[PDB]
Amino acid sequence: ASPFRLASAGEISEVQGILRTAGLLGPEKRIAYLGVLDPARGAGSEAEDRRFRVFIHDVSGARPQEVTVSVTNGTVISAVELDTAATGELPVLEEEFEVVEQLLATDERWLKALAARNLDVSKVRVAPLSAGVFEYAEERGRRILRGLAFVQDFPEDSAWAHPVDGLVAYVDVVSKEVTRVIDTGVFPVPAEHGNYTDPELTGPLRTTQKPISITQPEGPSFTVTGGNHIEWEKWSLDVGFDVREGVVLHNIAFRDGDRLRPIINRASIAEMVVPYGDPSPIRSWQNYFDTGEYLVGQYANSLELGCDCLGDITYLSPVISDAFGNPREIRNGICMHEEDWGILAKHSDLWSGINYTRRNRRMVISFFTTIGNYDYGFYWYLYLDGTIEFEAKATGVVFTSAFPEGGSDNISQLAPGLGAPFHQHIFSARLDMAIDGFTNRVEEEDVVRQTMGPGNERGNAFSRKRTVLTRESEAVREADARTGRTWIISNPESKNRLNEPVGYKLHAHNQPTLLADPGSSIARRAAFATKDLWVTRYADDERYPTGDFVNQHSGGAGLPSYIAQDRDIDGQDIVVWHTFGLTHFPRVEDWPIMPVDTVGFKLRPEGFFDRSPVLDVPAN
Amino acid sequence: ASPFRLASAGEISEVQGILRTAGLLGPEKRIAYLGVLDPARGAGSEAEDRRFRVFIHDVSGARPQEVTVSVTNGTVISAVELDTAATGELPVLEEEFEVVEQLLATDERWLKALAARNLDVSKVRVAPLSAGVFEYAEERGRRILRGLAFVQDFPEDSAWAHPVDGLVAYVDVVSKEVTRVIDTGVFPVPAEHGNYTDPELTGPLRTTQKPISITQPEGPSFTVTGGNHIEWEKWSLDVGFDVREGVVLHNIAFRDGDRLRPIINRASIAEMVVPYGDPSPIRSWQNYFDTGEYLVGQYANSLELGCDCLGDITYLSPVISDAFGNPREIRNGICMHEEDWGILAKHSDLWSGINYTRRNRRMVISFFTTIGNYDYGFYWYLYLDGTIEFEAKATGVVFTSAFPEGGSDNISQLAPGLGAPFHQHIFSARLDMAIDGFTNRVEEEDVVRQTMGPGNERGNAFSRKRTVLTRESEAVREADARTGRTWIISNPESKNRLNEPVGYKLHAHNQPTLLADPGSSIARRAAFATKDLWVTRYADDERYPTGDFVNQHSGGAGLPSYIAQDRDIDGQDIVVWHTFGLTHFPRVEDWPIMPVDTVGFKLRPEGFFDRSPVLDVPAN
Ligand SMILES: [Cu+2]
Ligand SMILES: [Cu+2]
Ligand code: NA
Ligand code: NA
């Protein structure tokens, strides 16, 4: 019944038939992206209109199209040819991963470089990497992928231990041409293996780990209705899934007594960028937008009970489309469960003699994704006390290079002759705010130091200042950990019983933002990442901080272009964009597979409730 | 057998007898502090010498003494009269808590102020607060406590909801004199109650929370031997307990294959300070060193299975001394258990087709303490991958005031007429480092931005710089979140297989440090808190960042005085002092009892192991 229900297999078959009868899905076509569109502002129209956005690629070489279709009304709504030299290529196709290794396997120049290194071609894996935009003018308009080579000694070998440095090729995957092959010098191929399941490397496994058993004998405290509508401990929300963004949260709300109070209309990780800091021309072009270029949702793992998700777990299995419009189920793609979170509140009073202790709990909603050497867990947490937290978990295998003779200021050595280039993982959270409704605004809050003097005779005083962001042109903000800087999203027209506007406070981790030079290509294409916080006026088509077509776009689209409109955000329908990430100087302990590292943010109520919202929690 | 074993009841009886026969523990004496001394550097002396340090107070008015005794040799080792006007008062006695309310209950000036507010004296609770050092010259040399009044409407009432503003008194607890009573004006006593167990306030309790069951059918994976020696998942350590510091960790080490590698010799929270930012003369003197002035260990709660500690929990019950030298057991004062911590490592490889997932685990060691309105949980965590984390959990009831007519820049309103002054909770972690032994050093690590140009043609490069701290005079460091600043403690004489010095990286949360004016009394007495990081050369008697006698000391002792020696720390026996804390602008949701807020730090291996140390973890 709900317009926010997950796309069904049936709905996706219907989309493929509508594109077929309309003659848009010919045998030369590929679906590069398919997703349900969110209902428009003011869903007061009786009965939904399930619409779908589709990106259609033409392998033969024709121009691609952007298509909207209504499955409610079996009709194509719009269909637009795209000039990709202008607005950007389409997302990388999964079938294109192999084409780079196969195109290179017959190229004369490729084989010359391999033979000079005594590499058997059937042993060389080639990674299909996004091209970006640089100085090669013949790439404009063309669908380009660059290739980096790794040696696999045998089928089960970890190729990441054997990079082939000094060598890169570029590939046009439509016309199937190796446009360039660059060989800047021979580097020794690192010899040590990195197979983390070889008893030779692991040694004997531990016998010391006794089991931890986490059960819920009466089942879980949350309920799911309609496929994806969660109700848990006064929280209410819909779990959506998009093949580009991954897990999306809609209609996050809190049942304060008898009325349902909205908090966030839509929450998602709307882009990630991984820029590399090795200035070597073999790699100085390396930057991946995993979300924008590859679509992280389509590589969601299936999560195993007992290994990935432990406890009483409820699964969701979202449906996406393959390149031909057939429905594909991702079995057990989303984990949801509650877990114990220690003490919520505690006090033993000397004067009343009353002792009081309550436990905290969190709702967990997660999925895990693999793009090549990288694996990423996306975790959303809901806590009893109203706090909302996001956490990214980064693991997998580090991207490797050779370690140069006598060192490097931009690469870490992980094993003899084996290096790891410096890089970042930067995420963009897009928070469509709905603090007690849609009239919201953002204040910046700084700690204020006071000087010893009149009115502050003992020099102990300190305060805080709040600056309202009224226009988009002044809502591009930087962190300042030293002054305790946070941001409050409030509703100026909704007050608590103290006659204060209700609000939520955003707590950032204050990690470094984009390190690249402001004149670089990557600072241009990933402008959102140069700043910690952006606020925009909501608009239906302002969906991604980089725009709709990241692959080989020349830069400027998305956030820098939205805020140019200089719209009013003082008490309006606004969207908060928060940049946060990890700056990774790889360590020996990251090799040969890396332990999880984490980064995130959280939002806590700030005068949203009239008292603590967890007075009614039992003792058990 | 171990010299780091917890003090026993027998040992404490023996201490009381030795002080008795020696005529130091007369009927006018009080033990204000008793603790075991750590073994000296080079414990190669066969058989230990269990020594004890004792602070002895004289209620009659004589001078107090500092005494060392050996229970191994039943002899007093040293005994020193103290000039407390010079070196500071002794810690606050527990029996002194009542004396302020009883001394004030017969004072003419106190009763005059109460009658002008129609307060029945038998209903007024008085909080015994530390005095600090300010402008009152008659306080030098005297044992002073200040008193703030709260109304209790009935025995089980929460007095914190009913502060009596505009009123403070000062009290000499030795001669029993009310030295001053200041009444700066009448404020309405806030009327709403804050009883969080009253069904009227809580409403009906939730019936929606189903149970979470955490069991270990084969028992826990860690072993305890000798009372307090932990071995768990290659970790090894001793859990100590001191009535001032609380839980202390000794001899933290990691079993890397066959050899036992030390990491940290001694870890403790060596001081906490809570400064208030309300400039009102009723409160502008308010600062508590809970550790230094009150001794947090002696207020450790007893932790209930199922409420405070959930799972398969092992308890320790430490023994301390009461004011008369009788042993007092704190039943179930320390919780230790392991808990599941999600995914440790994960990768699905496209080319090898191998799927790999491991879970992480943490060892938990905690206690909980109550000082008046405040409750604090101290958590030390040990992780499979070598990470060490500390976490403070702050809860209890916020300290309250009246909320003034038409607002305040230094106080939050929590209920009609009820305010909460701004304040901080600042902790000092003292880390006696032993990275693969005692030759250690500290480098500061900053991210380095590079300009687009020659050698960096595409403007993508970035690097990092490490600055060695060689003398104490240059080891007073500040955070800088914007440049990713961290600190590495390494051993220049111990290398990994890449010929890099092994090391651990300290990750700080980068919260604001002491906000008070640098000329304030509190910036003088709490100098450690004005800076994020200090490094000192180890010395037996350099134990606390504030010195041994915090109560009413005029300032400068501890860290600022140690570093003046300008000793060498480049490859030496060093101690790291890390300042971290919470800046608390109270919110409505903090009332009437506050949900937990957290702050901490962590240390991760940085080239300490030759590869990942968790390759040998099973799948289960
Ligand atoms: Cu990384
Ligand atoms: Cu506080
Ligand atoms: Na909004
Ligand atoms: Na040391």
Tab-separated table of C-alpha atoms in Angstrom, chain B residues 183-346:
chain	number	residue	atom	x	y	z
B	183	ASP	CA	22.996	36.094	50.605
B	184	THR	CA	22.977	38.077	47.373
B	185	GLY	CA	19.217	37.993	46.838
B	186	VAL	CA	16.153	35.779	46.984
B	187	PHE	CA	15.372	33.545	44.035
B	188	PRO	CA	12.164	31.493	43.754
B	189	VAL	CA	12.854	27.851	44.614
B	190	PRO	CA	11.846	25.823	41.513
B	191	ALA	CA	8.637	23.921	42.269
B	192	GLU	CA	8.422	21.041	39.736
B	193	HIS	CA	9.700	17.741	41.073
B	194	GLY	CA	12.317	15.676	39.293
B	195	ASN	CA	11.562	12.200	40.631
B	196	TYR	CA	12.259	9.851	37.712
B	197	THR	CA	10.620	6.886	39.462
B	198	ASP	CA	7.269	8.608	40.022
B	199	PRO	CA	4.657	7.031	37.687
B	200	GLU	CA	3.167	10.526	37.481
B	201	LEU	CA	6.333	11.711	35.748
B	202	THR	CA	7.285	8.545	33.841
B	203	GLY	CA	3.816	7.613	32.658
B	204	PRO	CA	3.115	3.928	32.085
B	205	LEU	CA	6.265	1.912	31.498
B	206	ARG	CA	6.933	0.337	28.108
B	207	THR	CA	5.779	-3.211	27.429
B	208	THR	CA	7.515	-3.287	24.037
B	209	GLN	CA	11.077	-4.205	25.039
B	210	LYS	CA	11.724	-7.892	24.475
B	211	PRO	CA	14.736	-9.455	26.224
B	212	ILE	CA	18.225	-9.788	24.764
B	213	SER	CA	20.003	-12.874	26.070
B	214	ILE	CA	23.812	-12.858	26.031
B	215	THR	CA	25.360	-16.105	27.268
B	216	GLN	CA	28.642	-17.992	26.949
B	217	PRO	CA	27.740	-21.693	27.196
B	218	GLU	CA	31.392	-22.787	27.413
B	219	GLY	CA	32.312	-19.876	29.682
B	220	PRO	CA	34.543	-16.898	28.934
B	221	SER	CA	37.652	-16.966	26.768
B	222	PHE	CA	39.799	-15.066	29.286
B	223	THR	CA	41.425	-16.512	32.390
B	224	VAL	CA	42.176	-14.856	35.729
B	225	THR	CA	45.020	-16.128	37.895
B	226	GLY	CA	46.413	-14.734	41.128
B	227	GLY	CA	43.367	-12.570	41.776
B	228	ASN	CA	43.894	-9.941	39.068
B	229	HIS	CA	46.130	-11.203	36.228
B	230	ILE	CA	44.194	-11.342	32.956
B	231	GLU	CA	45.148	-13.393	29.896
B	232	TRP	CA	42.835	-12.980	26.885
B	233	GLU	CA	43.320	-13.468	23.147
B	234	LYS	CA	47.128	-12.878	23.250
B	235	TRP	CA	46.717	-9.960	25.693
B	236	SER	CA	48.187	-10.051	29.177
B	237	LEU	CA	47.794	-7.550	32.040
B	238	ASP	CA	47.161	-6.930	35.750
B	239	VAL	CA	44.038	-5.114	36.969
B	240	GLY	CA	44.985	-2.878	39.900
B	241	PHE	CA	42.736	-0.702	42.048
B	242	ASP	CA	43.562	2.472	43.937
B	243	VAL	CA	41.103	4.406	46.077
B	244	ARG	CA	42.125	7.666	44.382
B	245	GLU	CA	42.574	6.624	40.741
B	246	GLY	CA	40.129	3.717	40.547
B	247	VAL	CA	40.918	0.914	38.118
B	248	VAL	CA	44.559	0.936	37.065
B	249	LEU	CA	46.085	-1.294	34.416
B	250	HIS	CA	49.634	-2.635	34.831
B	251	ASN	CA	51.937	-4.552	32.499
B	252	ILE	CA	49.792	-4.456	29.356
B	253	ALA	CA	51.492	-6.811	26.896
B	254	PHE	CA	50.833	-8.769	23.686
B	255	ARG	CA	51.968	-12.346	23.002
B	256	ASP	CA	53.303	-12.038	19.448
B	257	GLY	CA	53.906	-15.651	18.581
B	258	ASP	CA	56.203	-16.881	21.323
B	259	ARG	CA	57.589	-13.675	22.882
B	260	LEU	CA	55.664	-11.368	25.198
B	261	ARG	CA	55.885	-7.779	23.967
B	262	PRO	CA	55.170	-4.963	26.442
B	263	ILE	CA	53.049	-2.035	25.321
B	264	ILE	CA	52.103	0.065	28.360
B	265	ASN	CA	53.615	-0.229	31.823
B	266	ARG	CA	50.834	1.608	33.709
B	267	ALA	CA	47.546	3.126	32.547
B	268	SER	CA	45.217	5.223	34.668
B	269	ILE	CA	42.952	8.234	34.741
B	270	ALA	CA	45.177	10.331	36.994
B	271	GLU	CA	42.904	13.391	37.506
B	272	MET	CA	39.527	14.795	36.537
B	273	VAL	CA	38.367	18.384	36.798
B	274	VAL	CA	34.835	19.781	36.462
B	275	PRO	CA	34.980	23.596	36.060
B	276	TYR	CA	31.797	25.673	35.934
B	277	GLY	CA	31.296	28.656	33.623
B	278	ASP	CA	28.595	30.558	35.508
B	279	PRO	CA	30.202	33.863	36.597
B	280	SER	CA	27.680	34.392	39.414
B	281	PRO	CA	29.546	34.800	42.753
B	282	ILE	CA	27.290	32.121	44.251
B	283	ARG	CA	29.073	29.653	41.926
B	284	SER	CA	32.078	31.240	40.138
B	285	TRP	CA	34.415	29.372	42.541
B	286	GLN	CA	32.944	25.958	41.635
B	287	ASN	CA	35.502	23.425	40.334
B	288	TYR	CA	35.803	19.826	41.481
B	289	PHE	CA	38.764	17.552	41.027
B	290	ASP	CA	36.776	14.382	41.649
B	291	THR	CA	39.927	12.258	41.436
B	292	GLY	CA	42.276	14.540	43.383
B	293	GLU	CA	39.968	16.074	45.986
B	294	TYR	CA	37.333	13.350	46.576
B	295	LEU	CA	39.037	10.102	45.438
B	296	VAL	CA	36.718	8.446	42.905
B	297	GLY	CA	37.683	4.877	43.841
B	298	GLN	CA	36.148	5.045	47.292
B	299	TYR	CA	32.706	5.786	45.815
B	300	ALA	CA	32.716	2.842	43.405
B	301	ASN	CA	29.239	1.354	43.094
B	302	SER	CA	28.422	-2.304	43.494
B	303	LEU	CA	27.487	-3.429	39.975
B	304	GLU	CA	24.388	-5.618	39.611
B	305	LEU	CA	24.352	-8.558	37.229
B	306	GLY	CA	21.766	-7.911	34.531
B	307	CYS	CA	21.479	-4.143	35.076
B	308	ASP	CA	25.034	-2.742	35.170
B	309	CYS	CA	26.824	-5.705	33.586
B	310	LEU	CA	25.095	-7.982	31.072
B	311	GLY	CA	26.471	-11.266	29.786
B	312	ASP	CA	28.876	-13.781	31.305
B	313	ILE	CA	30.557	-11.394	33.774
B	314	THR	CA	33.510	-12.019	36.120
B	315	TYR	CA	33.709	-9.689	39.126
B	316	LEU	CA	36.574	-8.333	41.179
B	317	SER	CA	35.896	-7.017	44.703
B	318	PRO	CA	38.727	-4.680	45.744
B	319	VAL	CA	39.571	-3.900	49.359
B	320	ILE	CA	40.171	-0.358	50.612
B	321	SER	CA	40.520	1.178	54.078
B	322	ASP	CA	37.988	3.242	55.968
B	323	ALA	CA	38.872	6.316	58.014
B	324	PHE	CA	40.024	4.094	60.883
B	325	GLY	CA	42.097	1.552	58.987
B	326	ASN	CA	39.526	-1.230	58.942
B	327	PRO	CA	39.345	-3.134	55.633
B	328	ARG	CA	36.269	-2.391	53.531
B	329	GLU	CA	35.276	-4.641	50.654
B	330	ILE	CA	33.618	-3.114	47.588
B	331	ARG	CA	31.555	-6.097	46.499
B	332	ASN	CA	31.407	-6.475	42.695
B	333	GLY	CA	33.219	-3.182	42.141
B	334	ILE	CA	34.817	-4.155	38.821
B	335	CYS	CA	33.127	-5.798	35.834
B	336	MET	CA	35.110	-7.744	33.282
B	337	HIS	CA	33.648	-9.555	30.281
B	338	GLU	CA	34.174	-9.942	26.561
B	339	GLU	CA	31.651	-8.737	23.997
B	340	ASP	CA	31.095	-9.207	20.292
B	341	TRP	CA	32.220	-6.212	18.213
B	342	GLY	CA	30.888	-6.839	14.723
B	343	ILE	CA	33.087	-7.500	11.699
B	344	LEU	CA	36.862	-7.522	12.155
B	345	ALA	CA	37.813	-8.079	8.480
B	346	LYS	CA	35.939	-8.911	5.298
